[PDB]
């Protein structure tokens, strides 16, 4: 008559992720409909269909003067906790996890006078050297050149290239898996204005859209606040 | 989600005959074939297709002289722990149990000189009186007469007759269920020889084959050794 | 309503080989593909399709001089922990277990000058005597003769012959189940060279391939290191 069973040693323990609920103490509670639009099932979803300003210096944009040329314009170690990619949606989302596998996109919204032209260059430096510091060094890598004047912004896709199928959403001392490299933009042509008088500098917004192959795997509690 | 159960009071107890095994700690152990003949599934089986010498006096046989006649030749209280039926296979098997329901067979292998004849009588005395002690008393019961000379042995089936469907594999103080009676053999004709000189006595083996309707039910541990 | 159950006495115990896993605390973890070739499911597999040098003296080979003849060349008690078969893949695999049932193969890679010939004899001595010590004694058993010169190596299959369906992967004091015998090779013709000057000795490699009917059964923890 009575069934025969054996408790596992574990048995009367907790389990903070038991695939299966608990005992339904209140029942039959019918719930009212919801008419609110702008709903979501997936979080990656929102960061793909939405950019966020990267924080260069304390602002979300770099400058372009008619006295630049050689010098780098913008640089940062492509890892989801590198300075610039700190305040972004896409990067702040990440920290509920431990891993990402995606190429990112950036959009350069030039905001200088409508009598200003700046022309220009972006470059992705895979990890190896110790940060090229002149386009003449950087142009020998993957780069794109762009001429503001009629465009009114631009887009560059920093891909995913590495031996590991997933990388780290957390930066740390130089590993083959932390760093994916740098992202760089250069003054391929020092800015110009109707008068150097009226128009001193031009600027450019650096917006970060999640790439089209990007995804976060593995949820993880939050460490300490540092 | 979690199923609702209730342990019986018994619960975390032993049970030395739980119809169901235990946890298989080693698995997939394929086992090699067996080519040995003379195998068995059932124990009754072996005692049916096999006799065993009953121990009369300390030997498995009685005598037959040309000076007998009246006196009984062999007698024993038909119960599976009566003297003679002590050393037999059929009787020694029994004690792993508590009950039997079978009529027994006995075979009388006469071993006297080939110049000897003995003629003779067997008799089954159901329980009632206090042991008839002359054939003239015993022949009025169920008996069989046999003449050695050309036979070279004989067989007598001591049946099962009693009000209980099973009896006791263990003998005890006179009960309606212990004793099934006696088994007796008589000198219906005192032995004869070529010369009383050469051939003094003849003998006869008393072999016990399990009957054809005999069976043991109920296993039981062994008491003390007595 | 509530189901009735009864815990076995065992119940809240360990079990280091419970045929059944545990509670899945992390779920839905999709895993990336693997493109690495040279993969395996079964361990016997690798030792069958792969030899390993037996360690004679401290080296994996015996010699052949033009001064031998009678004397044995190589000998060892065919049991998976006998000296020579100590360093081999096939023998070192074994010790995760307790039993084997296979005939072994050996390959004799002769390495002497290309101006050298050695001719020769191998022999398997089933267990009985106390090690024959001259071919004249050994040739009366199962043996094979081989002539280097154009061959460039040779193969001998030491079979499985014994009353037990599985033997011991662990050697011990003389048992009917430990020892399967000896393996012997002889100088059926003392070596020869262009000049006894240039070519002194010839050698021969003793490689051990798992036999074609060989298998290990029963995993077992490792004892002490001795």
């Amino acid at each position: 008559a009575p069934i025969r069973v054996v408790s596992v040693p574990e048995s009367d323990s907790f389990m903070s992720s038991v695939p299966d609920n608990s005992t339904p103490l209140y029942p039959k509670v019918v719930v009212p409909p919801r008419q609110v639009p702008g709903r979501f099932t997936n979080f990656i979803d929102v960061a793909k269909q939405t950019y966020s300003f990267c924080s260069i210096s304390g602002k979300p944009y770099f400058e372009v003067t008619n006295t630049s040329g050689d010098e780098p314009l913008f640089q940062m170690d492509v890892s989801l906790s590198a300075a610039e990619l700190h305040g972004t949606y896409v990067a702040s989302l990440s920290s509920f996890f431990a891993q990402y596998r995606g190429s990112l996109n950036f959009n350069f919204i030039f905001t200088g006078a409508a009598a200003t032209k700046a022309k220009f260059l972006v470059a992705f430096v895979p990890p190896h050297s110790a940060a090229p510091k002149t386009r003449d060094e950087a142009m020998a890598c993957i780069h794109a050149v762009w001429d503001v004047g009629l465009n009114s912004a631009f887009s560059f896709n920093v891909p995913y290239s590495s031996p590991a199928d997933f990388m780290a959403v957390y930066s740390a001392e130089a590993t083959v898996v932390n760093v994916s490299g740098w992202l760089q933009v250069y003054a391929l042509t020092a800015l110009t204005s109707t008068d150097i008088a009226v128009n001193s500098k031009g600027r450019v917004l650096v917006a970060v859209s999640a790439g089209p192959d990007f995804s976060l795997r593995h949820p993880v509690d939050l460490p300490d606040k540092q | 989600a979690p199923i609702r159960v209730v342990s019986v009071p018994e619960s975390d107890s032993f049970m030395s005959s739980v119809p169901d095994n235990s946890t298989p700690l080693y698995p997939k152990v394929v086992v090699p074939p067996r080519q040995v003949p003379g195998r068995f599934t059932n124990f009754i089986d072996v005692a049916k297709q096999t006799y065993s010498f009953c121990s009369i006096s300390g030997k498995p046989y009685f005598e037959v002289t040309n000076t007998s006649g009246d006196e009984p030749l062999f007698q024993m209280d038909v119960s599976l722990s009566a003297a003679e039926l002590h050393g037999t296979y059929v009787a020694s098997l029994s004690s792993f149990f508590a009950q039997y329901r079978g009529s027994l067979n006995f075979n009388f292998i006469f071993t006297g000189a080939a110049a000897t004849k003995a003629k003779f009588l067997v008799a089954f005395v159901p329980p009632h009186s206090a042991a008839p002690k002359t054939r003239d008393e015993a022949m009025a019961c169920i008996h069989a007469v046999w003449d050695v000379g050309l036979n070279s042995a004989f067989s007598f089936n001591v049946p099962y007759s009693s009000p209980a469907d099973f009896m006791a594999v263990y003998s005890a103080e006179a009960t309606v269920v212990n004793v099934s009676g006696w088994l007796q053999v008589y000198a219906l004709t005192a032995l004869t020889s070529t010369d009383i000189a050469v051939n003094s006595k003849g003998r006869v083996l008393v072999a016990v084959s399990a009957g054809p309707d005999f069976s043991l039910r109920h296993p039981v541990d062994l008491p003390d050794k007595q | 309503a509530p189901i009735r159950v009864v815990s076995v006495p065992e119940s809240d115990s360990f079990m280091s080989s419970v045929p059944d896993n545990s509670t899945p605390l992390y779920p839905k973890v999709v895993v990336p593909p693997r493109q690495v070739p040279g993969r395996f499911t079964n361990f016997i597999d690798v030792a069958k399709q792969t030899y390993s040098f037996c360690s004679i003296s401290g080296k994996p080979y015996f010699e052949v001089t033009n001064t031998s003849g009678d004397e044995p060349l190589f000998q060892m008690d065919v049991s998976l922990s006998a000296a020579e078969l100590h360093g081999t893949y096939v023998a070192s695999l074994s010790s995760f277990f307790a039993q084997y049932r296979g005939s072994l193969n050996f390959n004799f890679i002769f390495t002497g000058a290309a101006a050298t010939k050695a001719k020769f004899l191998v022999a398997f001595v089933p267990p009985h005597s106390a090690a024959p010590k001259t071919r004249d004694e050994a040739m009366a058993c199962i043996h094979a003769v081989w002539d280097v010169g154009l061959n460039s190596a040779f193969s001998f299959n030491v079979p499985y012959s014994s009353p037990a369906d599985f033997m011991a992967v662990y050697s011990a004091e003389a048992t009917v189940v430990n020892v399967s015998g000896w393996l012997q090779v002889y100088a059926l013709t003392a070596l020869t060279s262009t000049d006894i000057a240039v070519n002194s000795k010839g050698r021969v490699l003793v490689a051990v391939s798992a036999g074609p009917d060989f298998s290990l059964r029963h995993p077992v923890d490792l004892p002490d290191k001795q």
């Binding site: 695939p19 299966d20 609920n21 029942p27 039959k28 019918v30 409909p33 | 989600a1 | 899945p24 779920p27």
Partner: peptide, 21 residues
């Protein structure tokens, strides 16, 4: 969501959870 055990519906979905419309 994280309930991939075939015992979750011991309590039918009325008692289990809620309902919309």
């Amino acid at each position: 969501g994280n309930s991939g055990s075939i015992v979750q519906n011991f309590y039918m979905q009325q008692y289990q959870n809620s309902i919309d419309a």
